[PDB]
Amino acid sequence: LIPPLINLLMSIEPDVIYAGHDNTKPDTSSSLLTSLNQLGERQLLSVVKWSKSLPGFRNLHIDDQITLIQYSWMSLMVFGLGWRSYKHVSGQMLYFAPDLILNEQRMKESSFYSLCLTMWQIPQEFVKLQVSQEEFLCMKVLLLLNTIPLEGLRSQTQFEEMRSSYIRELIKAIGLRQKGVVSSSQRFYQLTKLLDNLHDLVKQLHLYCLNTFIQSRALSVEFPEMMSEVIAAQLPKILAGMVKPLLFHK
């Protein structure tokens, strides 16, 4: 059977979110970026709601909660994207939403082809490692907890306890399918290494995002209120390396 905390995590996963994109009109650079931002605003709102039901999280100081959402949002959404593309279209298309799915041909014509390719690494890797939903749900929580300020958080003790709690839960998640100490131990390394590597992938998306933000009026891309808030609140500090990424390995 499934360990209780893992079962809870599945019950609090967000519902399907639509882009609201008008697919009865040809893709333009403007229209895609507008749709992706509208969709992202909605996904981040659902991440915030999610976090209010995530055990441990509401007991961190409110300022730590805000900071962790502001540090981790891009990671959470690209990781979510990865999981949907894996589960719904065998990882061979980018499943942003049910009404916004890019096959490779549509990616090629997007104007951010290589960004699509960067993002496409995750679901291909999911296919490769055959990640289970139980492993995914634990890893996703660890991403939320994967960077802290250089001075630490106000609720550092509680945070350490929460992060350790979810690391122990991933170790239980691995034990469900994988049998053998050797196999389980190596799988713990693989999954935690994947999380480590996401720091580098996310940095590329952060730089693309901030560049597009700066040039938004010339490019005619709308940046929503919360999106603009999180960008202005932490993105340059993050890109500058003025935060502490938490690595599982050397």
Ligand X SMILES: COC[C@]1(OC)CC[C@H]2[C@@H]3CCC4=CC(=O)CCC4=C3[C@@H](c3ccc(/C=N/O)cc3)C[C@@]21C
Give me the residues that bind ligand X (CB under 6 A), please. 36-37, 39-41, 43-44, 77-78, 81, 96, 112, 115, 205, 208-209, 212, 224, 226-227
DSSP secondary structure letter of residue 98: T
| Least Å from the CB of residue 212 to ligand X | 4
- Considering the complex, state which of residue 208 and residue 248 has its C-beta at the smaller distance from ligand X: 208
Buried b (16+ CB within 10 A) or exposed e, 2-36: ebebbeebeeeeeeebebebeeeeeeeeeebbbbb
The H-or-E segment that residue 175 falls in is helix 156-177
Are the CB atoms for 232 and 186 separated by under 8 Å?
A: no
147-148 vs 244-245, strand pairing mode: antiparallel
CB of 109 to ligand X, least distance (A): 13
Give 171 or 226: the residue with its C-beta nearer to ligand X: 226
Q: Which two tokens stand for residue 247?
A: 């690595």
Beta carbon nearer to ligand X, 5 or 68: 68
> What is residue 93's DSSP assignment?
S
Question: Residue 201 Cβ, how far from ligand X at the closest point, in Å?
Answer: 10
Shortest distance, position 84 Cβ to ligand X, whole Å? 7
Beta bridge partners of residue 100, listed in sequence order:
97
Binding residues for progesterone: 84
Distance CA 246, CA 229 (A): 24
Least CB distance to ligand X at residue 80 (A): 6
Q: Shortest Cβ contact with ligand X: which residue?
A: 40
Q: Which is nearer to ligand X, 137 or 227 (CB)?
A: 227
- Residue list, annotated binding site: 84
Rounded to whole angstroms, the maximal C-alpha distance in the chain is: 57
Decide whether 23 or 183 has the Cβ nearer to ligand X. Answer: 23
